[PDB]
Amino acid sequence: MGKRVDFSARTVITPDPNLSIDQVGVPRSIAANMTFAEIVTPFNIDRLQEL
Amino acid sequence: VIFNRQPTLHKMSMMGHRVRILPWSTFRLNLSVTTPYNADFDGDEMNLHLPQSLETRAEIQELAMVPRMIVTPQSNRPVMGIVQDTLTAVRKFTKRDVFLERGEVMNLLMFLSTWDGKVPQPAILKPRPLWTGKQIFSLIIPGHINCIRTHSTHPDDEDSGPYKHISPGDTKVVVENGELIMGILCKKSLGTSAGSLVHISYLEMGHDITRLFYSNIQTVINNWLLIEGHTIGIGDSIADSKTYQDIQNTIKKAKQDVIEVIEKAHNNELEPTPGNTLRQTFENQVNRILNDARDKTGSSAQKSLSEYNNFKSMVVSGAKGSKINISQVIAVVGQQNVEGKRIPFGFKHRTLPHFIKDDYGPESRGFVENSYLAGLTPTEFFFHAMGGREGLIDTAVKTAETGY
Amino acid sequence: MIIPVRCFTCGKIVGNKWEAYLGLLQAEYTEGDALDALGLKRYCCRRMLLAHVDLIEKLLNYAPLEK
Amino acid sequence: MNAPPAFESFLLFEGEKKITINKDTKVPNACLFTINKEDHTLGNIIKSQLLKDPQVLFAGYKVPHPLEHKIIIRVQTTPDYSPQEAFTNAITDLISELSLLEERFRVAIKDKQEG
Amino acid sequence: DEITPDLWQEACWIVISSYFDEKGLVRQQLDSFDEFIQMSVQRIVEDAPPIDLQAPPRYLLKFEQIYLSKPTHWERDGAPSPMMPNEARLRNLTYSAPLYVDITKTVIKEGEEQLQTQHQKTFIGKIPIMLRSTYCLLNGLTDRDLCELNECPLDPGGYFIINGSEKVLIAQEKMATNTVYVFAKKDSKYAYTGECRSCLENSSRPTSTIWVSMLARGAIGQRIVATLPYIKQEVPIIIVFRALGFVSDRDILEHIIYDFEDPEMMEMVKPSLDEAFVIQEQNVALNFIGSRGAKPGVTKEKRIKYAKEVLQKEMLPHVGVSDFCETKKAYFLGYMVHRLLLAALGRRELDDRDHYGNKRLDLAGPLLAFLFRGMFKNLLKEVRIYAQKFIDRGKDFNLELAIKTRIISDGLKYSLATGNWGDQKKAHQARAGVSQVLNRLTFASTLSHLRRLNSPIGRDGKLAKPRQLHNTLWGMVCPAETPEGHAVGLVKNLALMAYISVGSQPSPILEFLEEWSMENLEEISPAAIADATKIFVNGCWVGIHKDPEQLMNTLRKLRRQMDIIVSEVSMIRDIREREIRIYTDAGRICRPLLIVEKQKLLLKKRHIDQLKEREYNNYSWQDLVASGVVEYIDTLEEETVMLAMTPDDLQEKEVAYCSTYTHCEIHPSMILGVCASIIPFPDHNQSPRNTYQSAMGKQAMGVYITNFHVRMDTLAHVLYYPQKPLVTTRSMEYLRFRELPAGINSIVAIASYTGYNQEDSVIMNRSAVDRGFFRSVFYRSYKEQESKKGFDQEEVFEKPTRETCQGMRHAIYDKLDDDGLIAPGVRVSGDDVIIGKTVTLPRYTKRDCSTFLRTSETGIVDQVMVTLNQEGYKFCKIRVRSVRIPQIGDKFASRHGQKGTCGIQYRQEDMPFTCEGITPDIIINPHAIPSRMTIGHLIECLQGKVSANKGEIGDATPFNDAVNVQKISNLLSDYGYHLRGNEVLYNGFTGRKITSQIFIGPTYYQRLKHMVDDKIHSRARGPIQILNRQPMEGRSRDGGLRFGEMERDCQIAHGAAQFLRERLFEASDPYQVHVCNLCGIMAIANTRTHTYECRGCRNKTQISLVRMPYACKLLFQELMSMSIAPRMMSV
Amino acid sequence: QPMIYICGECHTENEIKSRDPIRCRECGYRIMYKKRTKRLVVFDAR
Amino acid sequence: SSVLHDEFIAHRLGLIPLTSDDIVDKLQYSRDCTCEEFCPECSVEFTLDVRCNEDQTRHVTSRDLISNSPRVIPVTSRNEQDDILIVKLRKGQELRLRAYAKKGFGKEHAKWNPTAGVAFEYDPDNALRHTVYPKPEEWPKSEYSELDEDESQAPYDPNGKPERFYYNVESCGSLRPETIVLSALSGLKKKLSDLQTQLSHEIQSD
């Protein structure tokens, strides 16, 4: 019913008046640790090769 | 991503957010979206979950995104509203005597995302061009929504007499065609209640427009508050000598009243009321006297406040605090209760060893006749600690049963 | 543990004033008059000298690691 | 762990432009100047100098995020004038003002040390 | 002669300082341990019975004397050397001293062939020693001597060092013993129950509880019963009285009812008599008791013997366990019945379970005594078996080999090391939470942990009554300091002048009462008890008296003269009920108070004069107590005391409140504890705020101890520039907060500036932080040891190599030396190696077992220590040093519950400034004040502005009428500032004035241990658990975050089924099984050869692949383990 | 190669090889400390 | 061997002001220097070598910071005010280090901030009403005020603008206060000049 999961992060929260309500400000280390598996296509072949 | 805070009580405790990468090592949140999470920044931590497929990403983007989460099905009202600084500041900003200069107005218009680039004609052209705070909030307000509200300080006998549609106090909020025609905005107009501007924006305009409305209120109002400023200090906790004399006279009269009731009970000149024993009737009379004293002193303190008082500013806007807090800071902290009754005789017929036996007076049984600025006496301090321990125990014991 | 170099608020140098401050205090100055003699006029620098606890003097009661 | 180097507020990253001009399409004769690695120090003076130009209809600036190190200055002028020309003249006027202020401060220092 | 009011604030605090010069803050711990070593161990050894063993020759083996030497340590060569506590901390030794016992073995065979052989100083065990106790090597040492030994002179002691770990014994609350308590349970068969947890003076058995209850109404009337120990059936009280030799009903009611003119008591006891008339003689009553027992002897003889033994030993041991005590036991049981009847008749109040006069604090001494009794009994048992197996062969034996000293040593060491208070075998019946690891995060945390009390009611209990702040905690327990989590009200803290009594023998008091006009209980006639006053001593009714008033006067005079009655003896005269209860036992929390004459203090000005020159004429606190000027009053004697809050209460007033006071407070602020005594103006805050600060002063950074350079603590935070508060209370002078402060005075502005301080957050000055503002250093110690446990496999510190080591990570080992240990001064990043350890195999003949850094730390090696542990293999400790500069997300707090994280940091040009260019160090939001009502924060800010501008330290002592806000404002207006602490500030970005004048000034802020860098964590396909293939738990394990049941429910409400499946299936534990389409049970798949078959159905074609969580496969297999057939049917 | 250590009590520089009990040769004290490395660690004075 | 760890000493040395009057304009930023890590064109070498052999505590002060450049020295060491205290040493303790000083400003670190307070004020009598005193009588008068004592604030000026700004620039020691002001004006002017150069390149590139 509940379990531990991958692709999760946790840290202290902080105010930021300059984010929209639907935005979350994320550290670069959390974002560098966490990844999203994006499928390659001719639409994104160049960008994904760059990455 | 899904952004979550524990305990996850309702569906608004896990909402979808768009990631914005920023330098330091904390999760940075907008301040309107803190009330849904029940989150403050005193060391709270939150959980970020990254969906790992286009299907889950589309699911979160079309179901759980924060703008789609503005109105809750629990109580058919907004779940997030305008909050502390932005609410005190929008209250101060939409007052009738807020006049902005050309440079200040351009500074604020820099922070409107939904601005058509047209400077509005100032409300005052001569002797010097001046825009009003309502005139800029009218630019913040989206679409052509129409809304009627009333500022918290709206007198109840104003809608009957004349001046119903021209309010002397600038209460009676009226937004027409997306312009704040009149009124001071506050919790009642921008908070999480039903029929407020944020609710009507979400119902008439979409969730996207309402998202921008939240963001624009916050940015414009915070950058204006950089000019106006908001604070609180000792001077806001102080009252004039007349108010102090009135409060002390009220307390002295209340203590003499309680002494009279005690003397009546001691002489068997007190007869019980239907449905209560003599002890309970005496307790009811004493508690009524002391509650009357607390309320009268609180009213004295409240009327003593100026328009510049920052406690009154935050209470009026609804940003934080209540009139009882002002009364306890200025007038009197009042009766301390343990299990809904006065301080019990924990010693033998005594609340403390500093009192005589069988002393049902107000100070013996836990009436704090001082304010927080005046400072509590040692017995008032201990009784207040007892009353506060009751709240701590309640907060720490209700959680298991409510969660179960 | 040791007197800061600068005032945290303004950045005025207070590192060279601790010893003079103590010498003025043993000269039967009041703390306020001593702080006035050293030229600490902003209450931030007066905070720096007046609230300092010289813990290094207690850390020097322990013999070092090498003789 | 996540602390940016303190020089990133002042130093331009390789391939990053100091200033970028983008036409504002909402109203005519308006431009957005995105200036990297500057802050309120130049933004406020440039804005206030632009407000002294009667041919400038709008002059504002913002630091979109304090943790980021750029400013955006929006300038709208009258149709016969240009926001780029207004921005240039504002910088020229600020430079001349500061040169005059520097020379006069040198003179005042010389007078004070001499008598 | 009299101390006038204008001098009082000095005099009282002078008195208070003298107290803390005499006692300290951990006096209860040291006195408890000292009494345990001086008295309790000897009493336990002597109270054990001599073990008489014989086949013939016989041996008694009587233990007669104990000797506890100083703490020593035995090396492998065996040379005893004096071991210093710091050496114990560094080497992971146990700071214990050897206990030797004198043994006397006399041979007695026949013919008066007697000869005694005495073994002087037989090593019986090792006892861990509390630091700074009398038997500690740091006892009586000067500060220079302690610094010579690398000890902090401010270290209070009061703790043990077990295996290098500092362990502190928490005082445990318990109901007092030998006292009758009449309660009334609403949901029970009994209307009223009078219990008495009885325990003999020198403990040898547990508390034997006896109940005397009344059956709830609905045969004819209310029957009184008695639930005796070791008997599983209620017994009528009359039966018990007859079993004690009182058969006549007149005698029984003489013992129960002392006033025969009272028919109410009579008719209420009559049902019990009517129920017991068939039994009318002692032997029959004893037979009835034995029959109702759980071991009913078939023959009435052994039944009667068993009943005799129970009624003589288990029933009311405190009254006396010898024979011929039936009269005392009858009188006491009659008193229990009398108390029950008084409660049932409404003539007495039910006793309050929460009254601290009814409680006792089980301190280090009496707790170690419980352990020592159990352990010495086990030791004597083992000696009995060992000696028996030898004398059965008819030959002598060596007691030195009979005494296996590991019992006492390992028992005390284990119990103090783990906290499980009890035998190691009974690890579940044992009660944990005793003996916790001493908190060394800040000096206040250490002091509070050493003054910590515990109510073992159980955190699971949701009844608020034991958690409530009782009235009787006044002066004994801090009203504020308590954890706000699940242990609200259960974990408590001593008030500053609170002293837990250590215990004393009632012998001199009883002897004086004998010489005085008291009449013993066996010599009187019951008819005298009516008008006379009972006298109880430690719960035992010892006699009666005729003039209780002048008896109390005599006893109070005796205690105030330091005569036969010692200071800690409580003497309560209840007047309405004529008892006089005297208590000498341990665990009674009490506090000192100023005695009051007719309406005057006995503390004259001469005492203050002699106290002022305390350092010359050696006139101390004890001389103040001996002068009869001060008195220790316990919670139970406070009920009979009339206190004056201040000597101003003793003034004659227009309407006198009392005019008959007996004592006075030394100062009311002493009701607070260690951490609440740091709050300035706590009487101007809401009390929850004071509790939250009392909890948060313990996470504040500072200098936790002066000798931190030599300690190899696992975690330690030291602040670069600790400051004493500009605004302080007069109690911190004794907490040593001025010598080891835990914060910095920050120019704080309460303002709304840019919105980055909203909702309990702060804006800090980046320029101040650059100047060392709230900078700290974090010290982390790693320990390692190379074990040569056997020739099969041995570890060793040596620089590993890629050609010989097998489990060698890709991280580089170049930072290590040839000894395998990194050197100090080497900068080490996350995942780096600090100790190169290799273990011999059964990538050949040695595997890598190196110690890495805890990931994502990035410190510098502070130092490396190498030594030998107790058994003697090489042992290393490496302290790594990491500078923590405050940043966004670090938690800060004032002393008023005002906590918050750093929202953003602005440079000095970006912060708002006053006309004189002062920028705030911190900016906090005004919205944190109104709901919280932390007016103490504002008064402290204003007082701190006055203090900084005046060159003084503000006095924020709680209840001080010489300091109010108007005086502080008038003082501040003299320094050219707005009297209310406001200033015109300018916007740092634009330089324009802020329309609203901001409230700014110095406030003492604290940096708390909770830094964001120790909390930030992320995961993307890391390690998984072995049992269920799910992410690990924790940052340290690189674990994943729990998507719990409530998150599942939230996403169900959202309707996000694919996200729910991603979180609960695909991001946690994806798995595949092969199922038989016929029986639905997991089949056998062989994907390499592609052969799938179900052994059950004997098919190999109808198999299906099922994608299920691994936890669900594990569940179904654990159900098949239970003979359940969960058949996953795919059709 | 030498790995010279310092004594915690006598502060004596003494060489100890591997597989040797940790004992100071001057006073027999059992706790030793490593000396500061010779490697070059750099600090930004910030 | 001192009781303060290495980063403590380093941080403490960074905050010692060094006379920068004529040398700061000549030195280059190490970013701009075409040398290796260091050279005399972009940096100044300091050496400190102290050992407490005597029984009294040795005060390692800024006087012990020996420089290779005579022009760039600790301010207190310049030829009264005592020397800044780096660390106190006990007999047998020793501190030997080698520092390099660089060119920077307060945006990067407060140690490169030359000011010990910049008092800035305008409109001492609240004539523009940029502040709104709830009780103007309660507030003390500015040192630059020109009002009789009965008058609390100046009459409101509707046509007024902030002019006449008052400054008190206090120097930490590195630069002279007038050198701080002149260098500030020059630096602001060069910021604007560089901005105009980049502006011209952006305009002409379009």
Ligand SMILES: [Mg+2]
């Ligand atoms: Mg929180």
Ligand SMILES: [Zn+2]
């Ligand atoms: Zn300063």
Ligand SMILES: [Zn+2]
């Ligand atoms: Zn099958």
Ligand SMILES: [Zn+2]
């Ligand atoms: Zn040695």
Ligand SMILES: [Zn+2]
């Ligand atoms: Zn160079």
